[PDB]
Nucleic acid binder design. Structure first.
Lengths: 77, 50
RNA sequence: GCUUGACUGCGAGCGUGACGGCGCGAGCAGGUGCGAAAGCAGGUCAUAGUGAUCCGGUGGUUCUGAAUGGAAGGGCCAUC
RNA sequence: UGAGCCUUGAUGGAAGUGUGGACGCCAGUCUGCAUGGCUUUAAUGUUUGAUGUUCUAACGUUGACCCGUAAUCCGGGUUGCGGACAGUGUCUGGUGGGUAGUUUGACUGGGGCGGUCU
RNA sequence: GUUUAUUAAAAACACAGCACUGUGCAAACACGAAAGUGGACGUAUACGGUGUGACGCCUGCCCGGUGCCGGAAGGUUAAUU
RNA sequence: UUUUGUAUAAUGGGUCAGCGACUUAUAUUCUGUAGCAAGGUUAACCGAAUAGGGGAGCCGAAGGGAAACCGAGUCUUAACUGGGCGUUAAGUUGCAGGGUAUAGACCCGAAACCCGGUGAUCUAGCCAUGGGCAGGUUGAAGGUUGGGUAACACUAACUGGAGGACCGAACCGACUAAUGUUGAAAAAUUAGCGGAUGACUUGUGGCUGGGGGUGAAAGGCCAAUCAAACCGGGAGAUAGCU
RNA sequence: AGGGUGACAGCCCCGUACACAAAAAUGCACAUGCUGUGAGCUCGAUGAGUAGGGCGGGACACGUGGUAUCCUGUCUGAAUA
RNA sequence: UAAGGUGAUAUGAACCGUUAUAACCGGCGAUUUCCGAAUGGGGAAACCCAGUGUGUUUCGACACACUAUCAUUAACUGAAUCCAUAGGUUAAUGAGGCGAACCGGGGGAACUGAAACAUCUAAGUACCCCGAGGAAAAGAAAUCAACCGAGAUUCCCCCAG
RNA sequence: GGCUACGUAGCUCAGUUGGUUAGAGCACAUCACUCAUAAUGAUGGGGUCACAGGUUCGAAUCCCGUCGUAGCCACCA
C-alpha cells in the first residue's frame, strides 16, 4: 500500500472543484519513493518506502531513532 | 543539513568543519561513504573541542 | 436679450395599478433666474425613448465597529 | 553560451613624426599609444536559463552470474548498461463525446417551419 | 461462409486481395487505482488500427476549411518568483 | 367518473363477503372555551412523582429610527405651516377546532437514477480434452512409359488422389407454403428447401459480469428478460398527470 | 393480583399478602493471601520537521467572502518564559 | 422435592416406583460421532487420503493421539559473504470464526428539493469496510469572558429559528 | 472592459531615434525607337504618414483620445 513507513502518511480523499465549483471526488496521495538508506549502526542498507518529509524526518531525527519507531511499532522493514 | 567533515573532500575538505552541504550530497554520499556526519547540536561539540 | 428653476428639503389633496409601481399637484422652508412690476420657472405642447432584486464599484457620512483604541466589514445618502 | 546592477567602457620637462569611433540635421591633417628641456561596438565578479563534458551517489534495468532454493514469483548479493535522465507525488497551461450530468422557451385555430414576445 | 434465438438470410456482415497508418520491443495497443497479463515465449516478410473488398482495365483535379505530420525564429500565454 | 354537455356507441365495475384512502408529531396563527390579569406562564430538573418545588426563560405592559440615540413621542430636514410610523381597546397560559410550516402529510400507480450483491446449467466468443460425416461422382499437382525436342518445351496413354470440389442419408441449418394461433408446441407439425472433409459439426469441463461481457455487426446474445441483466437496498424516489 | 374448575368463586384448586430456605456454582461489594505493579522525599525536566507560512482540498452554522479558527496532500519552517 | 413415573403426535408393549438411588426441578461434573473458523493434506460441506507416535498371552492391518497459518518470545540451527544477517526446525503463549442494536474510525451515492438545472440540496444520509466496549467516544483549558468574572468531559432545557 | 500590434501614392509599401527633402513596385500620362506592336527609356501627374490634440525652433519619426484591427486573456448583477 501507498503508506509512508515513517510518517504513516496515506492517501486522503478530497475534491476537485471547477471554476463553477463542480465537486468531483479525487485523492491526494503521498510523495512516496522507496530508498536505500545506509545505517552503519548495522553495516547494511535498508529500503524504506518513504515520503519526502519521511526523508526530511530521517534527516533530522536521524535513521536509528526512526528505526526504533517501526520496530517499536512492529513495522516489518 | 550542515554536517561535520571527516577527511578532506571537495571544495570544502578540512577533516572537521561546519559546512552547509546539499542534503542529497549529504545523506546519499558523504555519510554512507563516511566523509561527514550530521551536526545534531551534540555533534557540534565533539569537533568543536578541537 | 438675459439666463440655470433640467434647484435641495417637503407636500394638503388626487389619479392609476392584484401587487411591485407609475402619474398629477397647489402650498410651506431654504437659495436662485428673468421681469419696472403683477408674476413665471421643481426641464421640454402632452402621451413612447425602457429593466425589479441580488452581487459589486465609486464619492460622501463619527451612524455601526465582536476585550479597548483604531481599522476591516456593514448601514445610510448620492451614483455606476 | 541568453540577460540586469558591481566590475574590465565614458560624461550634464614646451613644440616635433600627427592615422578608425564621437545622439556627433550631415565623417575636425586634432589628441594618446615607445618616446621630448553612471553604454551598443564587449567581458571580469555575480543572482539566473539552454546545451556538452566530469563528480559523488541517489533512481531505473522486462542484461549476466550467485544465494535463499531443485523456484522464469520476490529478496539479498556481485556486475554490466542507463544515470541525476527516466519515473512518481503536489501544483499547473493545453487537449479531451473516451466518459458523465444536464439544458435545448412560450404563444399557435394540431404540431413543425414562419411570425410574434417590452 | 455469417446474421436479427422468436415477422428481415439479403444487395447487409465476413472473406481472400488492396491501400494508408501506427509500432524498434519494457513495442504500439488493450484489461488493470497497482502489481501484473494479453500483444508473443512473436520482433517490421512482425504486430495493432482504419478504409476497400476475388479477378480484369483503372483510380483524374482541389490542402481554402477540419484533422494529421514537420517546423530550436518571433507574438500571446499557467503554476512559480 | 369526467365534462360546455353523457341513455350515450366515452371511463370503471361479472357477483358477494372482508379489507381499502385527510393521520401523527412539533412549531405558528385565528375562533371557541377556561384560568388569572397589567400581568400571564413556567422548561429541564428535584419529587412526599398527575401534587409540591423550580420563573432559567417566553409573551405582554412603548414606540420611533438602518443605527447611535430619543422616548409618549420619534423619524424625516438647517427647520418644519408639515409628513411617515406611533400615543386611545389587555394581555397570557391551558384545553377543543379551522388554516399554515416541517415531515411520505389524503390513498394506490411510473418510465427511471444510485448502492451492494447473484448469474456464461440458455446464448455469444474463446480455452482444454474426447466423438461424428451411409453411398455415389469429379480427376488438380506429382509419377511412369512411349512419341517428341540438341536438351527443355510439348504430347498420348496409364498411374496418382487434390478441393471452404460435385450428387446425396446420418448430422447441422431454416428459403417457400399450408396447418396451427384459448396450439400437440410461450416458434412447432407436414410437404418441398440449404450445407453435408469444413470458416464443419458434437459431449464434457473451463474463462469473460452489467455502462461491463461477448458480437463474420442485428442493438445480436449475456438463463422464455436487454438502447444497459437479475436479486436486495436508498424506498413511501418524484408524479403541476389519471 | 391472576389463572383454572361442567355458567360469573376472597373461603374447590393453583396462588396472592406475609414469613421463611441453599448442599453446590456464581454476579456484586468489601477483607486479605499469591503474582505482576509502582508509592515517598530532595533536586531537576516541561513534548520541532512542531507552531506559523505558500499551493490544493476538507472541517467549523459560516458556500473565500473583509474570514479569524481547526485538519493536512504538497513544498517550507520558528521562538522556547 | 416426591406418590406416582418411562418427552410430544400416541394409543399399546414391557417396565419402574410409593418414605426415599421412581420421575421431576436446580448447582457442579462426565460423555460429547461427522461437517462447519476446521487447523494433518485434499475436497463437489457432513467425504477421500496421510506422516509420526503409541495399541494387541490371535502384537499383521485397522483404531486412537498429534502435525494449518500468522504473531510474540526463546532455544537450536544458519546462505550469497567470514564475521553478521536473511533463510530453516522446535517450543511456549496469543490470535483466527459467529453474533441484534448502540459506539469510534476508513470510504461514500443518487433519486429528490431548487417548481428546469450546474453552485447549493438530499447528506456525511443509504450503503461497503475496519475496530472495540459494556457501554463507546470525549476530558483536566495554549477554554471562554470582557477589565467584572468563570473554571475538565458528557447529557437535558433555554438562549433562538 | 485588460493587455499587444498595426493601418502613409489608386492598388501595394518600407521608411523605423527626429531635424527630410515625403520612396519602391505595378497603375495614369506623353515624348524616343521602330515597318509598327509589345520589350524599352525619360519626365511628370498622384501621397494630405489611421483622424485629431500636445513635448520640440523643425514629429512619419516620441506622449495621448477615439476609430479601424486581429490575437488571446479575461469580466459581467
Amino acid at each position: 500500500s501507498r503508506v509512508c513507513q515513517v510518517t504513516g502518511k496515506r492517501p486522503v480523499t478530497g475534491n476537485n472543484r471547477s471554476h463553477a465549483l463542480n465537486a468531483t471526488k479525487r485523492r491526494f496521495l503521498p510523495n512516496l519513493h522507496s530508498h536505500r538508506f545506509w545505517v552503519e549502526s548495522e553495516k547494511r542498507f535498508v529500503t524504506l518506502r518513504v515520503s519526502a518529509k519521511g526523508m526530511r524526518v530521517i534527516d533530522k531525527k536521524g535513521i536509528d531513532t526512526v528505526l526504533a519507531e517501526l520496530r517499536a511499532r512492529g513495522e516489518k522493514y | 543539513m550542515q554536517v561535520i567533515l571527516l577527511d578532506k573532500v571537495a571544495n570544502l575538505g578540512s577533516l572537521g568543519d561546519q559546512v552547509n552541504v546539499k542534503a542529497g550530497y549529504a545523506r546519499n554520499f558523504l555519510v554512507p561513504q563516511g566523509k561527514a556526519v550530521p551536526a545534531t547540536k551534540k555533534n557540534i561539540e565533539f569537533f568543536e573541542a578541537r
